[PDB]
Amino acid sequence: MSRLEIYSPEGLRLDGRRWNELRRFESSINTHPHAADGSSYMEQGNNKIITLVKGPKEPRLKSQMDTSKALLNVSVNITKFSKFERSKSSHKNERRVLEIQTSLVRMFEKNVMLNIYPRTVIDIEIHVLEQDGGIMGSLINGITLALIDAGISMFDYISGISVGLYDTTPLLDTNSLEENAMSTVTLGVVGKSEKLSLLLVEDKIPLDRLENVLAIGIAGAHRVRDLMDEELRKHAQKRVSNAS
């Protein structure tokens, strides 16, 4: 029994949001010029991520080398101050995390034009600072910045969002309070399409909603890569207008 109010009959959420609404969504480009040529910062609500990309460059060992394409390393940093309650132990080989480290690779095996970057290394650095739930799709949207943040060869935008289900009703952009309150699904959505990169369900879901549930998140996901685009573009105008 929860002593609180999940979703109002008057249509409202905890901050008063509707079921089809987002948090405040902020990106940034070239946050760290002195660090790497890929440096981008995310605020999606209180989900705050520093995203860092190194490459395309020489390996540390000739063993870790291919004569066909690039490699992709995922290093996730969950701080012990990432949550309200401070976690005791470190996470650096936690089997929960390694799954995502697998996950973003196979999500991003297929945007990178791998053949045109052979014998070189791409390393993607993650710094999870403030954690607000919706944690999975929070990452991917930070990734899509960071590859463009160096301008690496690719096909498309890739969008990510967790959308939750309170009993019948979809919830775009849940939080961790709502995440522990109901069943949620995250979608790794590619560009403008209807094709998926990531699809992950932990919670128990009745089958019959799911087609409708999947039909929800696309309009959210399309508005994601929407808001990424111009925000890059108004940055992109700021270069040449003052470069030239």
Binding site: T120, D149, G151, F155, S244
Partner: protein
Amino acid sequence: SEVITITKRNGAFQNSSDSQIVTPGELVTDDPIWMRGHGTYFLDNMTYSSVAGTVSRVNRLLSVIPLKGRYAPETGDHVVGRIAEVGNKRWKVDIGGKQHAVLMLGSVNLPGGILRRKSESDELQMRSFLKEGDLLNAEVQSLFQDGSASLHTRSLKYGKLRNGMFCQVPSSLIVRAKNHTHNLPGNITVVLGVNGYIWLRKTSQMDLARDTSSWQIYSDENDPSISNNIRQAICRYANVIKALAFCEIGITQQRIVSAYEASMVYSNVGELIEKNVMESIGSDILTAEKMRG
């Protein structure tokens, strides 16, 4: 009269000519007549960019030049290499670009010249002439199938550095010209690499020879006679590089001279590090750019 810049800003993560600017995933056109080059991929009509950059339409060739990326190596360029590794008869050496350049064993100026011919005992002395991290003048020959290219030293003018100091910049602000070695009043010399690597040293006689012994081409020696008036004059040219680099300024040899004489306000050379004052001198030259040419 200070030690450190401590200025405070609390409560925030952060403080917060027309051409086509295109994104990845974006259609350019589907006129089939266009040709498809760099930054471009496609499906039979659909012209699709892949980076954050600009549409370049060359006369039937459409291609996308990005804005962000590493240094692109091209042949015949005058850059600076830092010695990464030694191979079989090969060397590895950083450009700053995507990968290392390679450098053949006989690709270098031998002491005594060509009268010193080949020897298999030379690979027993690879570490003799060269070792790690060292800096030099190199001449970009040609490439491989990927885009990785190689170097050589076909002159006396190319060779291992000494007599000064290194600095480095983004590769963008370095402008192209028909010349790259430059000699500056103060009896000193900039060796602007294209790739973003910058070596200063004292003007040699060979430098003086450009405008009117040979066994010292792998030495770690300098001229022993180095005044502080040399040395402190190095640092004044040193910071004004980073001034223009912080101010995003295309390097003109004269602008440096213009940077140097504008820096004659300040004799305290340590004051050449200020975010404002570099920007102020940066603001000086751009205003001074609005007079001459």
